[PDB]
Amino acid sequence: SNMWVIGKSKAQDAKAIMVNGPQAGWYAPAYTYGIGLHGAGYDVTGNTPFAYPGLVFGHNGVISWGSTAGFGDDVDIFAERLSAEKPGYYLHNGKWVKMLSREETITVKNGQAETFTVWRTVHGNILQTDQTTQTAYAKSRAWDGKELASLLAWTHQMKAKNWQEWTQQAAKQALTINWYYADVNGNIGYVHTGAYPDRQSGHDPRLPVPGTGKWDWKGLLPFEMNPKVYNPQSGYIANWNNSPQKDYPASDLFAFLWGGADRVTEIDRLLEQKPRLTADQAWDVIRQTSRQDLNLRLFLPTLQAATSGLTQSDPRRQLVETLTRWDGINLLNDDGKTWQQPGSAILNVWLTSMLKRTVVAAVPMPFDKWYSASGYETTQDGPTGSLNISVGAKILYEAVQGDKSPIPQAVDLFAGKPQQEVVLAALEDTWETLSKRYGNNVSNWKTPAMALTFRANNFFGVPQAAAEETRHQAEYQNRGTENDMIVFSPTTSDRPVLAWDVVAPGQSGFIAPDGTVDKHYEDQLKMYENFGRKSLWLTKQDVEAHKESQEVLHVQR
Amino acid sequence: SSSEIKIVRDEYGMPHIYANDTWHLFYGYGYVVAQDRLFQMEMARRSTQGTVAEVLGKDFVKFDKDIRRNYWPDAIRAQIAALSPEDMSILQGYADGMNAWIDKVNTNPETLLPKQFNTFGFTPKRWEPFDVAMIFVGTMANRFSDSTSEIDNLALLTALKDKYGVSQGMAVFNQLKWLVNPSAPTTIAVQESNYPLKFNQQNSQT
Ligand SMILES: C[C@@H](C(=O)O)c1ccccc1
Ligand SMILES: [Ca+2]
């Protein structure tokens, strides 16, 4: 998910601009739900995933808010000591403590019901994997026992009127999520919220710790420690699941890294390119980032250095020159199937070859597999989520940076071979692969574009609609499942705030028994495709003037 | 009126709820949700409580078991039981609102029942705060903030140390899975501040 907040110092014809693009994949009916609340201290409008009581993306006329996953390390695994002589117990603080357990029964449609037991320790629920007569692993979350607090914090924050009231709610959100703030006056802000463990000295948060007791957390870190900024001197706040702050440690996921190579740079570049941006230019960044090849900028210099001494009759040279002239912005050809430029195909093939020759060759099987993906992998239906720079690619990036990289290269991924040689060899595979498939005339290469699918199954893989309800979109766009923008103190409006969003395919997922689809079943699908958007109303006057239907219930608790 | 709940929908079908107190406000929220996404929410409920096999069958038994193995119901219930009346009104009103529409759906299914229920062969049932809370717990907390590969990481490190030796292996693990990287572009600029905490990167717990 991405987000960029533009403060008063960089906003044109406004005081603040917020544009949010949460990326959870695409679903039908829609991932989020548009809703407006007025009364009981609430006055808000926006949309939210699975219709949580608290709106993740919205505003109240004074401030606005957004989120992106934080991916900090808030989960550790404890290795519990078991005893065959004491089934159900574990050693903790010199004593055999009874584990928590419960019976569950899975009722199965047209099948036999299955019963099993779930076990838990002071550290967390026991994993059904990695299991021995002497060991069992418990998954420990810093947010354990604070789920409801986070839900309520996400709700209460909707009533904040300033930075102080707002951070008071962010301090209660225990999940690892990035919160963003903006207001009518032009103030903008950011908090990497969540609970993080205060770890014993010597605890490597990337690896398991014994559960016998000496490694138990000290408690939780204070809110003072949470990365945060109010009115940064840069004048903007941009995030794409990148690092919150200098020296802040990332999630322990082996495939997850915050390094020199980060897709968020694609946004910083566009925001710094122009001293000030208008609401429209800020919205435009969605279109540009969604089409931006993320690897071009990373390796182009390496490709240029390697081929700088080749003649033009060498096709490997010709491939790099092609990339040099490219802006990396993919566009569909008129066939609605191929890309105008073959850049991403060239990068994908080369990169795949680079990783196999470098990182992959230095990692022992089967772990080598973890670093082989180029980040372009996909299926007929297109990417299920966002596109990113792959973990192998990020590691490779440090390597081509040589000493400009702050990561000591314990082992040479190029294994003594000149980097140029390996780069030229991968370029050779690329020409061989691509030329054999598309002919020797690069200028007429029509490489496959990625498409986008609104899936009938929610991200769990469970049907949330009939298969037939799946929706297709010719152009894949590396953008939010939904996009919303709030603009404060717009100078061309009579309102102190304007907002927009797009919830595709539509507000409603309702189909009557006879098959009659609701009027708002698919009326935002085309809008999503062309980077369009519709107004979010807040004031009673606006809602009233745009009313379509009304209903009044009368009920007492 | 304090028992009034006005629902005004805009030109895109987006609902705006108007109500005096907390319970009524979220009652209307749950009501409109029940109208717009009843099938989606029902399947979401089953996905977050691990009861999909009940309606979809044997292909989802494993999925169900894994969901249940990743959370602790008593804990969730106790949290709800500790909620102040005002906070509880949120969850309780939302549940009640959904139930008011669900009761109309099961009272006149030949016109109000979403076709998917017909297709998948079952009918929707009442919601309780637990259910509402679990939607969030399961689709936000357990799925976006529950990430760790520590056991795999130790296996990788163990392999690297066997291949390259103890110190070299440790140093390579810090090359492929560094703890921090000072060149990482950050949302907060270095002029503003930095994270004060330093961490062990030698797996000293062993
Ligand atoms: C979509 C997801 C993410 O960033 O991966 C997310 C989680 C929580 C809040 C916003 C987005
Ligand atoms: Ca960890």
Tab-separated table of C-alpha atoms in Angstrom, chain A residues 30-383:
chain	number	residue	atom	x	y	z
A	30	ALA	CA	-15.126	-4.684	-3.167
A	31	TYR	CA	-12.406	-4.973	-0.514
A	32	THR	CA	-13.663	-1.841	1.219
A	33	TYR	CA	-17.017	-0.361	2.182
A	34	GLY	CA	-18.044	3.293	1.889
A	35	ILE	CA	-19.854	4.685	4.899
A	36	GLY	CA	-20.714	7.957	6.603
A	37	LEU	CA	-21.351	8.423	10.318
A	38	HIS	CA	-23.057	11.458	11.812
A	39	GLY	CA	-23.932	11.616	15.503
A	40	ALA	CA	-22.737	10.336	18.871
A	41	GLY	CA	-19.617	12.451	18.470
A	42	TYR	CA	-18.882	11.237	14.954
A	43	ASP	CA	-18.986	13.210	11.736
A	44	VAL	CA	-17.109	11.228	9.114
A	45	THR	CA	-17.018	9.936	5.544
A	46	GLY	CA	-14.787	7.524	3.620
A	47	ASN	CA	-14.442	3.780	3.162
A	48	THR	CA	-13.076	0.873	5.164
A	49	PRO	CA	-12.106	-2.800	4.755
A	50	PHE	CA	-14.773	-5.389	5.554
A	51	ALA	CA	-16.766	-2.498	6.997
A	52	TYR	CA	-14.893	-2.210	10.311
A	53	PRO	CA	-16.656	0.035	12.842
A	54	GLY	CA	-13.618	2.317	12.433
A	55	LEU	CA	-12.897	3.831	9.027
A	56	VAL	CA	-9.287	3.248	7.938
A	57	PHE	CA	-9.544	5.806	5.087
A	58	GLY	CA	-11.480	8.999	5.673
A	59	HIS	CA	-11.924	12.441	7.184
A	60	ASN	CA	-14.172	14.473	9.467
A	61	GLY	CA	-13.809	17.941	7.966
A	62	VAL	CA	-11.013	18.981	10.349
A	63	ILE	CA	-8.505	16.129	9.890
A	64	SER	CA	-8.078	13.123	7.625
A	65	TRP	CA	-6.376	9.779	8.111
A	66	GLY	CA	-4.899	6.817	6.240
A	67	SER	CA	-2.890	3.647	6.716
A	68	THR	CA	-0.417	1.224	5.186
A	69	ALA	CA	0.913	-1.935	6.814
A	70	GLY	CA	3.948	-1.207	8.981
A	71	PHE	CA	5.793	-4.542	8.861
A	72	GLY	CA	7.868	-3.903	11.972
A	73	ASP	CA	9.112	-6.886	13.969
A	74	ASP	CA	6.386	-7.334	16.597
A	75	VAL	CA	6.391	-11.167	16.604
A	76	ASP	CA	8.924	-13.547	18.155
A	77	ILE	CA	8.918	-17.348	18.393
A	78	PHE	CA	9.705	-19.092	21.656
A	79	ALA	CA	11.074	-22.663	21.645
A	80	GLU	CA	9.212	-24.450	24.414
A	81	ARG	CA	10.729	-27.351	26.317
A	82	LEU	CA	8.440	-30.365	26.546
A	83	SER	CA	8.619	-33.692	28.339
A	84	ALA	CA	7.299	-37.038	27.145
A	85	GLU	CA	6.601	-37.831	30.788
A	86	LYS	CA	4.396	-34.741	31.093
A	87	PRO	CA	2.220	-34.438	27.974
A	88	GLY	CA	0.606	-31.023	28.040
A	89	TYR	CA	3.252	-29.256	30.152
A	90	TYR	CA	6.285	-27.088	29.405
A	91	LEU	CA	9.256	-25.898	31.399
A	92	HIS	CA	9.077	-22.219	32.373
A	93	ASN	CA	10.961	-20.529	35.192
A	94	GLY	CA	12.161	-23.855	36.598
A	95	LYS	CA	8.658	-25.320	36.704
A	96	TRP	CA	6.465	-27.537	34.560
A	97	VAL	CA	3.540	-25.253	33.759
A	98	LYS	CA	0.267	-26.585	32.409
A	99	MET	CA	-0.430	-25.405	28.853
A	100	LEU	CA	-3.778	-23.970	27.875
A	101	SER	CA	-5.785	-26.266	25.624
A	102	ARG	CA	-9.176	-26.484	23.933
A	103	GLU	CA	-11.205	-28.889	21.819
A	104	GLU	CA	-12.411	-27.869	18.372
A	105	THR	CA	-14.706	-29.676	15.940
A	106	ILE	CA	-14.749	-28.908	12.214
A	107	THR	CA	-18.205	-29.603	10.910
A	108	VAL	CA	-17.924	-30.511	7.242
A	109	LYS	CA	-20.612	-30.232	4.576
A	110	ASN	CA	-21.285	-33.722	3.195
A	111	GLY	CA	-18.335	-35.091	5.160
A	112	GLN	CA	-17.393	-36.517	8.553
A	113	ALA	CA	-16.773	-34.022	11.320
A	114	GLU	CA	-13.222	-33.762	12.613
A	115	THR	CA	-12.119	-32.994	16.164
A	116	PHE	CA	-8.683	-31.762	17.328
A	117	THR	CA	-6.977	-29.803	20.107
A	118	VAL	CA	-5.307	-26.386	20.072
A	119	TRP	CA	-2.497	-25.715	22.556
A	120	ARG	CA	-1.155	-22.460	23.969
A	121	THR	CA	1.630	-21.327	26.340
A	122	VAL	CA	2.431	-18.089	28.150
A	123	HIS	CA	4.206	-17.188	24.904
A	124	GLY	CA	1.371	-17.850	22.446
A	125	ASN	CA	-0.472	-20.479	20.435
A	126	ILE	CA	1.589	-23.590	19.608
A	127	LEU	CA	2.550	-23.985	15.925
A	128	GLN	CA	1.345	-27.161	14.254
A	129	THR	CA	4.626	-27.240	12.555
A	130	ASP	CA	8.237	-27.974	13.493
A	131	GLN	CA	7.183	-30.535	16.139
A	132	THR	CA	9.276	-32.842	18.384
A	133	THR	CA	9.003	-34.944	21.573
A	134	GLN	CA	11.177	-32.297	23.228
A	135	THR	CA	10.220	-29.086	21.407
A	136	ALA	CA	7.209	-27.072	20.315
A	137	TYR	CA	7.210	-23.485	19.097
A	138	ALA	CA	4.870	-20.782	20.356
A	139	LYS	CA	4.182	-17.619	18.330
A	140	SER	CA	4.449	-14.528	20.531
A	141	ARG	CA	2.789	-11.258	19.454
A	142	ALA	CA	3.486	-7.911	21.102
A	143	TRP	CA	-0.155	-7.034	20.391
A	144	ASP	CA	-1.544	-10.139	22.139
A	145	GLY	CA	-4.639	-9.270	24.176
A	146	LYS	CA	-5.005	-5.870	22.481
A	147	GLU	CA	-7.018	-6.751	19.377
A	148	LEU	CA	-10.169	-4.993	20.545
A	149	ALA	CA	-8.111	-2.050	21.752
A	150	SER	CA	-6.801	-1.610	18.240
A	151	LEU	CA	-10.275	-1.875	16.720
A	152	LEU	CA	-11.571	0.720	19.207
A	153	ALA	CA	-8.530	2.926	18.613
A	154	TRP	CA	-9.230	2.828	14.887
A	155	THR	CA	-12.740	4.015	15.706
A	156	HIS	CA	-12.052	6.660	18.346
A	157	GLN	CA	-9.371	8.332	16.205
A	158	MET	CA	-12.181	9.447	13.882
A	159	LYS	CA	-13.168	11.995	16.550
A	160	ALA	CA	-9.764	13.700	16.872
A	161	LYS	CA	-9.489	17.420	16.076
A	162	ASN	CA	-5.731	17.907	16.260
A	163	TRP	CA	-2.353	16.153	16.384
A	164	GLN	CA	-2.432	15.666	20.153
A	165	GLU	CA	-5.900	14.136	20.342
A	166	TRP	CA	-4.998	11.914	17.381
A	167	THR	CA	-1.670	10.542	18.636
A	168	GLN	CA	-3.455	9.704	21.876
A	169	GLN	CA	-5.449	7.201	19.851
A	170	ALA	CA	-2.521	6.010	17.770
A	171	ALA	CA	-0.789	5.096	21.049
A	172	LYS	CA	-3.591	2.591	21.688
A	173	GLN	CA	-3.403	0.878	18.314
A	174	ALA	CA	-1.278	-2.240	18.969
A	175	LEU	CA	-0.992	-3.720	15.470
A	176	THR	CA	2.010	-2.782	13.316
A	177	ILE	CA	0.388	-0.223	11.044
A	178	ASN	CA	1.421	3.128	9.593
A	179	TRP	CA	-1.012	5.923	10.492
A	180	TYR	CA	-1.028	9.270	8.648
A	181	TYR	CA	-2.574	12.603	9.605
A	182	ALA	CA	-3.528	15.819	7.806
A	183	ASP	CA	-5.743	18.775	8.739
A	184	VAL	CA	-7.631	21.852	7.595
A	185	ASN	CA	-4.721	24.088	8.572
A	186	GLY	CA	-2.155	22.270	6.486
A	187	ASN	CA	-0.493	20.208	9.209
A	188	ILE	CA	0.548	16.692	8.231
A	189	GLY	CA	1.840	13.814	10.312
A	190	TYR	CA	2.920	10.215	10.608
A	191	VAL	CA	3.111	7.517	13.275
A	192	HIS	CA	4.426	3.980	12.916
A	193	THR	CA	1.978	2.792	15.537
A	194	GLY	CA	1.923	-0.494	17.373
A	195	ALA	CA	3.191	-2.538	20.294
A	196	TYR	CA	6.830	-3.572	20.154
A	197	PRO	CA	8.606	-5.823	22.662
A	198	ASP	CA	11.347	-4.622	24.983
A	199	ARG	CA	13.832	-7.443	24.415
A	200	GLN	CA	16.498	-8.976	26.659
A	201	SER	CA	20.033	-7.864	25.964
A	202	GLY	CA	21.506	-10.129	23.293
A	203	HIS	CA	18.166	-11.163	21.765
A	204	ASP	CA	18.411	-11.428	17.986
A	205	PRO	CA	14.850	-10.612	16.864
A	206	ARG	CA	15.401	-12.555	13.635
A	207	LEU	CA	15.764	-15.931	15.305
A	208	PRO	CA	13.906	-18.035	17.891
A	209	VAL	CA	14.510	-17.733	21.614
A	210	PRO	CA	14.243	-20.466	24.272
A	211	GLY	CA	10.956	-20.494	26.145
A	212	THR	CA	12.398	-21.681	29.444
A	213	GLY	CA	12.116	-18.138	30.837
A	214	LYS	CA	15.447	-16.311	30.655
A	215	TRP	CA	14.508	-14.906	27.260
A	216	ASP	CA	10.999	-13.640	28.019
A	217	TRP	CA	10.390	-10.052	26.947
A	218	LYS	CA	10.866	-7.320	29.555
A	219	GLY	CA	7.548	-5.841	28.517
A	220	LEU	CA	6.581	-3.468	25.742
A	221	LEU	CA	8.415	-0.386	24.522
A	222	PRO	CA	6.894	3.038	25.255
A	223	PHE	CA	5.033	5.129	22.651
A	224	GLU	CA	8.011	7.492	22.779
A	225	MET	CA	9.921	4.838	20.845
A	226	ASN	CA	7.406	4.574	17.996
A	227	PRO	CA	8.767	6.331	14.880
A	228	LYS	CA	6.773	9.519	14.305
A	229	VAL	CA	6.932	12.916	12.656
A	230	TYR	CA	4.804	16.048	12.694
A	231	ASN	CA	5.278	18.638	9.949
A	232	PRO	CA	8.568	17.277	8.518
A	233	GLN	CA	10.886	19.900	7.043
A	234	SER	CA	10.718	18.025	3.727
A	235	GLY	CA	7.121	19.142	3.457
A	236	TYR	CA	5.839	15.683	2.604
A	237	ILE	CA	5.319	12.176	3.927
A	238	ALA	CA	5.617	9.237	1.540
A	239	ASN	CA	5.388	5.523	2.220
A	240	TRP	CA	5.097	2.319	0.246
A	241	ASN	CA	5.700	-0.161	3.061
A	242	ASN	CA	9.272	1.136	3.232
A	243	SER	CA	11.205	1.868	6.411
A	244	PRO	CA	9.582	4.338	8.813
A	245	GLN	CA	12.795	5.755	10.192
A	246	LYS	CA	16.588	5.568	10.146
A	247	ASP	CA	17.813	2.549	12.128
A	248	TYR	CA	14.305	1.072	12.519
A	249	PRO	CA	14.303	-2.734	12.178
A	250	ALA	CA	12.028	-4.502	9.706
A	251	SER	CA	9.873	-7.584	10.028
A	252	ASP	CA	11.832	-10.833	10.435
A	253	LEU	CA	10.444	-12.256	7.145
A	254	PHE	CA	13.342	-13.662	5.118
A	255	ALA	CA	11.713	-12.347	1.959
A	256	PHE	CA	11.262	-8.902	3.549
A	257	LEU	CA	13.936	-6.172	3.384
A	258	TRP	CA	14.352	-2.413	3.805
A	259	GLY	CA	17.451	-1.636	1.794
A	260	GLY	CA	18.942	0.854	-0.603
A	261	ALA	CA	16.614	-0.484	-3.251
A	262	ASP	CA	13.079	0.549	-2.423
A	263	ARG	CA	9.984	1.255	-4.487
A	264	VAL	CA	9.084	4.252	-2.311
A	265	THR	CA	11.767	6.193	-4.161
A	266	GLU	CA	9.470	6.197	-7.180
A	267	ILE	CA	7.166	8.435	-5.146
A	268	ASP	CA	9.766	10.691	-3.491
A	269	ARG	CA	11.105	11.381	-6.972
A	270	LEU	CA	7.730	12.632	-8.247
A	271	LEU	CA	6.984	14.759	-5.172
A	272	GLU	CA	10.387	16.411	-5.154
A	273	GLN	CA	10.343	16.927	-8.899
A	274	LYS	CA	7.786	19.693	-8.420
A	275	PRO	CA	8.077	22.307	-5.671
A	276	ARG	CA	4.311	22.292	-5.209
A	277	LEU	CA	1.629	19.881	-6.380
A	278	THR	CA	-2.101	20.462	-6.930
A	279	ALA	CA	-4.750	17.958	-5.934
A	280	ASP	CA	-4.824	16.733	-9.534
A	281	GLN	CA	-1.056	16.391	-9.817
A	282	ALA	CA	-1.041	14.524	-6.491
A	283	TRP	CA	-3.729	12.198	-7.801
A	284	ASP	CA	-1.757	11.781	-11.016
A	285	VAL	CA	1.007	10.095	-9.013
A	286	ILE	CA	-1.243	7.060	-8.694
A	287	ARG	CA	-1.326	6.631	-12.464
A	288	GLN	CA	2.434	7.143	-12.763
A	289	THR	CA	3.443	4.833	-9.920
A	290	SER	CA	1.005	2.131	-11.018
A	291	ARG	CA	2.701	1.873	-14.415
A	292	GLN	CA	6.302	2.360	-13.263
A	293	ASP	CA	8.662	-0.536	-13.776
A	294	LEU	CA	10.429	-0.754	-10.402
A	295	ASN	CA	13.696	-2.376	-11.501
A	296	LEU	CA	14.730	-0.115	-14.392
A	297	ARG	CA	16.009	2.648	-12.116
A	298	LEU	CA	17.909	0.170	-9.932
A	299	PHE	CA	20.038	-1.633	-12.482
A	300	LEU	CA	20.133	0.617	-15.525
A	301	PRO	CA	23.471	2.142	-14.395
A	302	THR	CA	24.962	-1.353	-13.985
A	303	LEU	CA	23.732	-2.289	-17.432
A	304	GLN	CA	25.167	0.920	-18.865
A	305	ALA	CA	28.591	0.429	-17.282
A	306	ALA	CA	28.780	-3.168	-18.488
A	307	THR	CA	27.891	-2.315	-22.090
A	308	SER	CA	29.623	1.041	-22.363
A	309	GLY	CA	32.406	-0.456	-24.478
A	310	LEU	CA	30.318	-2.530	-26.907
A	311	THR	CA	29.725	-1.671	-30.561
A	312	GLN	CA	26.212	-0.951	-31.715
A	313	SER	CA	26.207	-4.127	-33.747
A	314	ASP	CA	26.234	-6.130	-30.527
A	315	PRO	CA	22.581	-6.816	-29.639
A	316	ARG	CA	23.324	-6.788	-25.864
A	317	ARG	CA	24.290	-3.151	-26.301
A	318	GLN	CA	21.087	-2.562	-28.218
A	319	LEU	CA	19.051	-3.954	-25.290
A	320	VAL	CA	20.551	-1.509	-22.781
A	321	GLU	CA	20.136	1.450	-25.134
A	322	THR	CA	16.451	0.462	-25.347
A	323	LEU	CA	16.261	0.726	-21.570
A	324	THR	CA	18.175	4.006	-21.583
A	325	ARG	CA	15.552	5.656	-23.808
A	326	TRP	CA	12.708	4.232	-21.738
A	327	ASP	CA	10.878	6.087	-18.986
A	328	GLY	CA	9.807	2.729	-17.579
A	329	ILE	CA	6.168	3.689	-17.777
A	330	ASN	CA	4.343	0.772	-19.399
A	331	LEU	CA	1.396	1.514	-21.661
A	332	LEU	CA	-0.944	-0.934	-23.355
A	333	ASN	CA	-0.876	-1.289	-27.127
A	334	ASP	CA	-4.185	-0.930	-28.989
A	335	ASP	CA	-4.694	-4.691	-28.787
A	336	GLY	CA	-5.270	-4.241	-25.063
A	337	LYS	CA	-2.943	-7.208	-24.604
A	338	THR	CA	0.679	-6.126	-25.127
A	339	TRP	CA	2.941	-3.381	-23.859
A	340	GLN	CA	4.165	-0.594	-26.098
A	341	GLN	CA	7.758	-1.155	-24.952
A	342	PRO	CA	9.596	-4.420	-24.222
A	343	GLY	CA	11.476	-2.958	-21.250
A	344	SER	CA	9.954	-5.046	-18.464
A	345	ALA	CA	10.473	-8.228	-20.478
A	346	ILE	CA	14.119	-7.392	-20.951
A	347	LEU	CA	14.599	-6.555	-17.267
A	348	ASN	CA	12.745	-9.665	-16.103
A	349	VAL	CA	14.779	-12.095	-18.176
A	350	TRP	CA	18.123	-10.456	-17.397
A	351	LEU	CA	17.384	-10.093	-13.702
A	352	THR	CA	16.237	-13.705	-13.447
A	353	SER	CA	19.542	-14.672	-14.991
A	354	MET	CA	21.539	-12.364	-12.710
A	355	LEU	CA	20.049	-13.828	-9.531
A	356	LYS	CA	20.647	-17.395	-10.699
A	357	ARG	CA	24.293	-16.540	-11.361
A	358	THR	CA	24.831	-14.619	-8.124
A	359	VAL	CA	22.729	-14.794	-4.966
A	360	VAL	CA	21.205	-18.130	-5.802
A	361	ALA	CA	24.603	-19.686	-6.467
A	362	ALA	CA	25.848	-18.656	-3.022
A	363	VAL	CA	22.909	-19.943	-0.994
A	364	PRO	CA	22.684	-23.646	-0.062
A	365	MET	CA	19.607	-25.580	-1.226
A	366	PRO	CA	16.816	-25.478	-0.700
A	367	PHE	CA	17.119	-21.924	0.638
A	368	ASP	CA	18.498	-20.832	-2.701
A	369	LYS	CA	14.921	-20.844	-3.982
A	370	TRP	CA	14.115	-17.844	-1.776
A	371	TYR	CA	16.263	-15.473	-3.829
A	372	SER	CA	15.508	-16.577	-7.389
A	373	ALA	CA	12.307	-14.645	-8.095
A	374	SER	CA	12.683	-11.590	-10.312
A	375	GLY	CA	9.510	-10.033	-8.944
A	376	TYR	CA	7.759	-10.260	-12.343
A	377	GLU	CA	6.316	-13.751	-11.834
A	378	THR	CA	2.595	-13.870	-12.524
A	379	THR	CA	-0.242	-15.896	-14.000
A	380	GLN	CA	-2.881	-15.472	-16.687
A	381	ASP	CA	-5.111	-13.663	-14.171
A	382	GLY	CA	-2.322	-11.184	-13.372
A	383	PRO	CA	-0.713	-10.328	-10.013
